[PDB]
Symmetry: none
Subunit: 54 residues, 10 copies
């Protein structure tokens, strides 16, 4: 539980993308049921030259 001490940029404990997507369900389905699930594109992180040092 100890973070980073030092550095030129010194990034921390960053959580960009995660979690449960349609997970951990308790399902009791009878006969004719539909449970679709659709997810779009996910971008987690640094984009377009981000977190750059001059």
């Amino acid at each position: 539980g100890y973070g980073n001490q030092g550095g030129g940029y010194g990034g921390g404990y960053d959580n960009y993308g995660g979690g449960n997507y349609g997970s951990g369900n308790y399902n009791v389905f009878g006969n004719y049921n539909q449970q679709p699930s659709n997810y779009g594109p996910m971008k987690s992180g640094n984009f377009g030259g981000s977190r750059n040092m001059g």
Copy 2:
């Protein structure tokens, strides 16, 4: 539970994207049921050259 000490930028414990998306459900479905779920694109983080150092 200790964060970052120091650094050139010194970012912290940043949570950009996460959580439960259609998760942790208790479902009892009988006969003809529909439970669709659609999610758009997700961008979590730094974009367009963000958090840059001159």
Copy 3:
């Protein structure tokens, strides 16, 4: 439970995007039911060159 000490920018415990989206439900559905759910694009974080250092 201790935040960041110091740094050039010194960002904190920032929560940008999260939470439960259609999650943690208790559902008892009988016969012909519909429970759709649609979410638009989500942008969580820093955009357009934000949090930059001159």
Copy 4:
């Protein structure tokens, strides 16, 4: 539970992409049921020359 000490960039314990995608489910399905799941492209990390050093 000890992070990085130092360095030229000093990146931390970054979690870019992860979590459960349609996982950890308890499913009791009877007769004619459909549970589709579709996920778009996922980009986790640093893109477009991000986290560069001048």
Copy 5:
């Protein structure tokens, strides 16, 4: 549980891509059931000349 000490770049314990994709399920299926699962392309890591040193 000890991270990296030092270096020219000093990258940390980065988790780019992982987690359970349609895994760890408890499934009891009777008669005519469909549980498809489709995943798009996944890019985990550094792309476009990222994390470069001048």
Copy 6:
């Protein structure tokens, strides 16, 4: 340009879903521009046992 003559139901020239979605554009973009476009789920046709004959 002649429609249907007869039948038990006698459906016509029905146009359910169509048209240009972000199409036929003339675009002159200079330098740093963004033109995103996101569309939700589209249902075109007859649903829930519609157009049934007793």
Copy 7:
């Protein structure tokens, strides 16, 4: 250009789903431009036992 004459159901020239999705564009892009496009699930046709005959 002559439709259907007769039949037990006598369906016509039905157009359920079609058209240009992000098509037929004239694009002149200079330097750093983004033109993303995301489309949700599309259902075109007859669903849920539609157009049935007793």
Copy 8:
């Protein structure tokens, strides 16, 4: 250009799914440009026992 004459069901010239998806483009791209395109699942036709005869 002559449709169907007769039959037990007498379906016509039905167009369920089609059209140009990100097609027929004129593109002049200079230097660093991104033009992504993502499409969800497409269902074209008759589903759930549709167009059945008793």
Copy 9:
């Protein structure tokens, strides 16, 4: 251009799935460009015991 005459079901000239997916493009790309394209699962036709005769 003459359709079907008769039959027990008498299906017509049905077009279920087709068209140009990222096709027929005129592309002039210079230097560092990305044009990704991702398509989800496509179902064209009759599903779930559709177009059945009693």
Copy 10:
């Protein structure tokens, strides 16, 4: 251009799956360009005991 005359089921000129997928392109690419293309599973035809005769 003459369809089927008759029969027990009398199916017509059905086009289930086809078309150009990333085809017929005119491409002039200079230096460092990426044009990926990914397609999901495609199901064209009759599924789940469809078009059955009692």
